[PDB]
Nucleic acid binder design. Structure first.
Ligand SMILES: [Mg+2]
Ligand SMILES: [Mg+2]
Ligand SMILES: [Mg+2]
Ligand SMILES: [Mg+2]
Ligand SMILES: [Mg+2]
Ligand SMILES: [Mg+2]
Ligand SMILES: [Mg+2]
Ligand SMILES: [Mg+2]
Ligand SMILES: [Mg+2]
Ligand SMILES: [Mg+2]
Ligand SMILES: [Mg+2]
Ligand SMILES: [Mg+2]
Ligand SMILES: [Mg+2]
Ligand SMILES: [Mg+2]
Ligand SMILES: [Mg+2]
Ligand SMILES: [Mg+2]
Ligand SMILES: [Mg+2]
Ligand SMILES: [Mg+2]
Ligand SMILES: [Mg+2]
Ligand SMILES: [Mg+2]
Ligand SMILES: [Mg+2]
Ligand SMILES: [Mg+2]
Ligand SMILES: [Mg+2]
Ligand SMILES: [Mg+2]
Ligand SMILES: [Mg+2]
Ligand SMILES: [Mg+2]
Ligand SMILES: [Mg+2]
Ligand SMILES: [Mg+2]
Ligand SMILES: [Mg+2]
Ligand SMILES: [Mg+2]
Ligand SMILES: [Mg+2]
Ligand SMILES: [Mg+2]
Ligand SMILES: [Mg+2]
Lengths: 211, 184, 176, 157, 49
RNA sequence: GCUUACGGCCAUACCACCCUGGAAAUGCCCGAUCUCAUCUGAACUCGGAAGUAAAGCAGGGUCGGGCCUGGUUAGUACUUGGAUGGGAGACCGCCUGGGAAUACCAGGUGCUGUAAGCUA
RNA sequence: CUCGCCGAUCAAGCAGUUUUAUCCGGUAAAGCCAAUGACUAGAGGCACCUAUUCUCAAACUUUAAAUGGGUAAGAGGCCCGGCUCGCUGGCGCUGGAGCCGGGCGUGGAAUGCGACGCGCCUAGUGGGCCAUUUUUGGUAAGCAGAACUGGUGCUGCGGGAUGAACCGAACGCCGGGUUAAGGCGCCCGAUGCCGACGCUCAUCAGACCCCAUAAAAGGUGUUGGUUGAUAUAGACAGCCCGAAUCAACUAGCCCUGAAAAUGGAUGGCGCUGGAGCGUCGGGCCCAUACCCGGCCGUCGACGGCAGCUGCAAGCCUCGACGAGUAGGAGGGCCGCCGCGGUGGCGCCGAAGCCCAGGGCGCGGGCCCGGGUGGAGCCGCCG
RNA sequence: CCGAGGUCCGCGGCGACGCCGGCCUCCCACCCGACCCGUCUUGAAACACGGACCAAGGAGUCCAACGCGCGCGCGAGUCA
RNA sequence: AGGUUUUACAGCGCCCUCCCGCCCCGACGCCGCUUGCUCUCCGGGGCCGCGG
């Protein structure tokens, strides 16, 4: 296909696959969660992200290639059930390609820029400065392997990425310094891979079900 | 002058602060040229009687005037003139608008003939009514032709930038007096 | 900010505009280093507007005066905590200087941050300036001047006044 | 190019507010619009009769003609570089009384209320409005309000 | 031989050259377009006072 | 205070469940001769007064949902104007002004006009 | 031409501007645990169902700016009385509107300005181009197509070596002064400062808007910085010795990455305690810009006149102003040919022609002198 | 006289061309500036066209009718 | 870290007082902002005084 230098900058408005943009090929990446995705919150406390530093658009092929690069390194260093990689960028922006412009012809309705609006070529994920690309939650002693697994996957992406070990507990939105205190007060309950926030502002029957 | 010192001293002796009254008078100098002006800024400079570079006017400071100075900020360099600035500008650069004409204030008969109804009969009345703005500031300030100031002797830091970020445009609180001594 | 010449220290205090809903709002004092008071008042509305919910129009400046050096004739070690935005990101940085006045040490920091890190004055945010004792200095370039009975010559004196005699039969001496 | 349809681009201006659909509240029907009063123009998609054009949505004019269900308004419309006085017929569901001159009429009655007091007291209280004057000189006490030292916080990624 | 289709570039400078004059609302504005029944009675109230 | 008639704003008024209440009034209720009405006196229409709170209705209740208001988010996001600012670029910082929204948190939950009537 | 200033910012009226008040909107942002649509993951309950979760919209949106659009800020107002009506109707006052009379300036935001007032006739143009920002198609284009504003076309001048468009600043002819943008080793005006601090060595160094390319990725080159860990219960390194050491990360400059054809380009020379990079100070250099003055013309005057003038179509005073293609208008004691008048000139030499002579006018042009020439010629009013 | 903008009620050497004056113009030299005009064009010094040189000739007219402005005569008339 | 352990055979801080112990210099070739009309036959250089 066309090199990623041509569809790197968010130059056009977001052009999603919808009722109007028909004929989009399937994105290269179809799986976004890997590892032991069916793990509890207290099993993978650590969390590290691949934060984007540039306002660009990553192709679905790069998201798929970096996912495989990060997945293979986590298996050989932490086991197939010692991590949970979550690609947090879904390719929704559809990039277009113009016709295979040739010398001339008595057909194709054009030869040059006449009717230049192109057909859907692929899908990219418009990422923002500070937006997480990939997230990996592992055990506390696997920090060196996650930083290296995400560092190798940066080479599959254009631009500049930063590997940041988050202060949040796992894939939740609560800090580690506040997580274990909220479990004791029954304010958070484990719901699958993460926790579900339970406020003190519902029916009291739901409060009795916790205690 | 001695009253503002007494008020500032009695507040510091009690451990408090004395915030002086915000300035009611400003002196606006057009620093940028005339070619390539935005139409909104161009209209404001015409209402300030600043139609050429390096000319000055006095502006009675209120919210209606300050928001006109903010909307024409990159083209002006204004501030709060002291008495010496107001005094020397009307003495050296002081020209009156008698009948749509730029007439030099060489005698008090030229001020008394036009501003005599407002009680302004001498050139010190014109200085007093402008430095300490009064009920007749508009007629007194509009009587004065826009002060045709000379180029700043010693140059400027940089004209295309605001005074805070190292340039000269915008509002310099009392440093406008340094600019007047070099342009007047 | 331009950081023209020396960066004098200003004690700029300010507060929100009082209202009937909030009479006598809290007063906030800042430690601003600026070339003049006009920039000091403008720097105040930049660091305070990002700490509290108050703009230049929402509040007022109560006092803005110079903070003179209490010991201009004593050599002091200054530890400066600052943050600057490089071409890639923002970095917290602690630098030590040795000057006679606080405003002189902060002025050295802006000349040094631009020399070693290409940081402009608008990208630097001085967070803390503190007179550090000689026991608590972390940089080795400062601790070398913490030697009593310090002795060093002035080797290889570079010739100045190169154009007072522009032409001369004497080649300059560099040893003195 | 575009179409010259009478409602091209009126997808949101003629729509109704969220959770404000249904029948028009009847107070809007029982408002009296005399001749010469200032009224706003805000078209509604519910009443497809007597709708103003999209160029008049948000404009303000005075009434010159009143009918059974509608009102004649004289509105200013800038075509290219000239402003023209347009006489449009709009039903009362798309208009409302303009509170623009209400602040003026309130001040007129208040000016006549304060100057007759001067003829009975002997004062000269100024009636003109004035822009926000510079803040007068005031003392800021620090008795129970000490200036708190603020510092820029370190950077956190 | 294609050309430029549409532009409003210099138009604003041409509009304000002679100024964008507002319509002069003269005193005693005209009575064209008023309700014919209303005008009919108004002309009866003028020929009898 | 309450019950109705007509309403105004049109959820602070809605929704779910629970509890309480009949002084007047309301509702249910009792009938189909007449007017009327349907497959069917259920409805609609008409005639009436044996019962009186089951429902409607009203008033409470719920760490209620929703809604409303405010705080927080946040001087954040974004944005007017400025630079011979930075950066290969993508973009970013500053100057001058304006200034959001959700999550989250807290409070509140119909107000009222005209007319008639009644003090459980 | 109608006026206003004259004849008192008298006041109106106006505005590519604010202020105050009042509306209008659905873009940025935000949101989807809110609807429509898209999409990831588990979890609970008896494939669904419930509570959560990841990620999105240009033709989605609860919400919602900045900038912006309209309107209102008085005598054309406000208040009061009477009258008219065939319209309206319980109610000649029930509405409504019209007509008439009376009362009340503290003209009831800021700033500016004579009204960009009212007409008539009207050329040129109807290929545009460019820049900041916004923005569509396209891999991109010194591409194509839009929006706001400026510029340019139509425009020279200082600076960017060079240049259409960048930066400064727009232009009558000058003197002095001072600046802008940009500069001050030499070319080349100005640092020939005993300028401040630091960074940096390049066997392709670097050298400033537009702008004349360079990246991902690397460096035990070098200088800062961040965060940890071992250390006088003896670390690190070397094979006991005796004091700091180690690791990761990051940021500047430099280096690698880095290959094109005639010989060549920070503009050139060259510069390495610099003539480089970053942060700054003082002094200095000059634009047709600004300030003061002289002069020319134009415009305006709320201007002056019925010993010298007074050709009033003249004269005098004061103030401001001055770019220009296409185009328009005015003035010409500019020029040419003939006519009606008028005033002349000429064989003692007209016209024409020539000139290193003397001059006048901003200029078109003109006068005079000299030479040649040999018979006609010119001024002024038409 | 710090006053409606300058005067000297100060003065020197040369003055009949040898040794004085002549802006501009002639020749020459230097410094700074400076690409070829016309034309079409968004853009011309253009590797766009026309032009080797000089003289003379050479292109907005006249007629009809119309419009508006102006001068003039008379005027509900006016023009024969 | 001077003298041999904190002033001793140098000095450097920080508190409590002693009228602020008391006197002396006021931004002064150690560091700012300005007249509340800064004062000067107060000096020097350049430019030109045109008209009437
Ligand atoms: Mg410019
Ligand atoms: Mg600019
Ligand atoms: Mg269409
Ligand atoms: Mg149509
Ligand atoms: Mg219909
Ligand atoms: Mg064509
Ligand atoms: Mg076309
Ligand atoms: Mg065209
Ligand atoms: Mg019950
Ligand atoms: Mg609730
Ligand atoms: Mg035309
Ligand atoms: Mg045409
Ligand atoms: Mg184009
Ligand atoms: Mg032009
Ligand atoms: Mg130009
Ligand atoms: Mg260049
Ligand atoms: Mg000059
Ligand atoms: Mg140079
Ligand atoms: Mg790199
Ligand atoms: Mg390698
Ligand atoms: Mg390095
Ligand atoms: Mg290199
Ligand atoms: Mg002048
Ligand atoms: Mg001209
Ligand atoms: Mg002829
Ligand atoms: Mg000759
Ligand atoms: Mg001559
Ligand atoms: Mg041609
Ligand atoms: Mg061409
Ligand atoms: Mg060529
Ligand atoms: Mg040829
Ligand atoms: Mg000829
Ligand atoms: Mg015609």
């Amino acid at each position: 296909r066309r090199p990623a230098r041509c569809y790197r900058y968010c130059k056009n408005k977001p052009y999603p696959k919808s009722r109007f943009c028909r004929g989009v090929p399937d994105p290269k990446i179809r799986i976004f969660d890997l590892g032991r995705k069916k793990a509890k919150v207290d099993e993978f406390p650590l969390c590290a992200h691949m934060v984007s530093d540039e306002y660009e658009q990553l192709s679905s092929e790069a998201l798929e290639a970096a996912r495989i690069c990060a997945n293979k390194y986590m298996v050989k260093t932490c086991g197939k059930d010692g991590f949970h990689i979550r690609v947090r960028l879904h390719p929704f922006h559809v990039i277009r390609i113009n016709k295979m412009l040739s010398c001339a012809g008595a057909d194709r309705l054009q030869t040059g820029m006449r009717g230049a609006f192109g057909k859907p070529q692929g899908t990219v994920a418009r990422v923002h400065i500070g937006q997480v690309i990939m997230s990996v939650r592992t055990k506390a002693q696997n920090k060196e392997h996650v930083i290296e697994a995400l560092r190798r996957a940066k080479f599959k992406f254009p631009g500049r990425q930063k590997i940041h070990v988050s202060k949040k507990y796992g894939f939740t939105k609560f800090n580690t310094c506040d997580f274990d205190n909220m479990l004791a007060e029954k304010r958070l309950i484990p719901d699958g891979c993460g926790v579900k926030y339970i406020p003190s502002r519902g029916p009291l029957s739901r409060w009795k079900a916790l205690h | 002058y001695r009253r503002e010192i007494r008020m500032s001293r009695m507040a510091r002796k009690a451990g408090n602060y004395y915030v002086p009254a915000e300035p009611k008078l400003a002196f606006v100098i057009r620093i940028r040229g005339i070619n390539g002006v935005s139409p909104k800024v161009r209209k404001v400079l015409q209402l300030l009687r600043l139609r050429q570079i390096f000319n000055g006017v006095f502006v009675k400071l209120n919210k209606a005037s300050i928001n006109m100075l903010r909307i024409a900020e990159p083209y002006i360099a204004w501030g709060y003139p002291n008495l010496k600035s107001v005094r020397e500008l009307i003495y050296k650069r002081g020209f009156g608008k008698i009948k749509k004409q730029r007439i030099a204030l060489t005698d008090n008969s030229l001020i008394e003939k036009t501003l005599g109804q407002c009680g302004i009969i001498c050139i010190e009345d014109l200085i007093h009514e402008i430095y300490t703005v009064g009920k007749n500031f508009k007629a007194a300030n509009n009587f004065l032709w826009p002060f045709k100031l000379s180029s700043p002797r010693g140059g400027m830091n940089k004209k295309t930038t605001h005074f805070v970020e190292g340039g000269d445009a915008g509002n310099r609180e009392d440093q406008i007096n340094r600019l007047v001594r070099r342009m007047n | 900010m331009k950081a023209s010449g020396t960066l004098r220290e200003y004690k700029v205090v300010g507060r929100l505009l009082p209202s009937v809903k909030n009479p006598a709002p809290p007063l906030y004092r800042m430690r601003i280093f600026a070339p003049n008071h006009v920039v000091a008042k403008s720097r105040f509305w930049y660091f305070v507007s990002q700490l509290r919910k108050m703009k230049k129009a929402s509040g007022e400046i109560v006092y803005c005066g110079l903070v003179f050096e209490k010991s201009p004739l004593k050599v002091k070690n200054f530890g400066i905590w600052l943050r600057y935005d490089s071409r890639s990101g923002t970095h917290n940085m602690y630098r030590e200087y040795r000057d006679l006045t606080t405003s002189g040490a902060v002025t050295q920091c802006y000349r040094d941050m631009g020399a070693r890190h290409r940081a402009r004055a608008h990208a630097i945010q001085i967070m803390k300036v503190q007179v550090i004792a000689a026991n608590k200095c972390r940089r080795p370039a400062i601790k070398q001047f913490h030697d009593s009975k310090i002795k060093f010559p002035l080797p290889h004196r570079v010739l100045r006044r190169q154009h007072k005699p522009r032409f001369t039969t004497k080649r300059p001496n560099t040893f003195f | 190019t575009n179409t010259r349809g009478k409602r091209r681009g009126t997808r949101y201006m003629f729509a109704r507010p969220f959770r404000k659909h249904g029948p028009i509240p009847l107070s809007t029907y029982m408002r009296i619009y005399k001749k010469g009063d200032i009224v706003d123009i805000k078209g509604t998609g519910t009443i497809q009769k007597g709708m103003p054009h999209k160029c008049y949505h948000g404009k303000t004019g005075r009434v010159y003609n009143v009918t059974q269900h509608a009102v004649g308004i004289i509105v200013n419309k800038q075509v290219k570089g000239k402003i023209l006085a347009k006489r449009i017929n709009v039903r009362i569901e798309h208009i409302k009384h303009s509170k623009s001159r209400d602040s003026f009429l309130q001040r007129v009655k208040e000016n006549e209320k304060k100057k007759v007091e001067a003829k009975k007291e002997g004062t000269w209280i100024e009636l003109k409005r004035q822009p926000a004057a510079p803040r007068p000189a005031h003392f800021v006490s620090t008795k129970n309000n000490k200036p708190q030292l603020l510092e820029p916080i370190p950077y956190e990624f | 031989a294609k050309s430029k289709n549409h532009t409003t570039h210099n138009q604003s400078r041409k509009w304000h050259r002679n100024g964008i004059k507002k319509p002069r609302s003269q005193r005693y504005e005209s009575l064209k377009g008023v309700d014919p029944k209303f005008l009919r009675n108004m002309r009866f109230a003028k020929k009898h006072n």
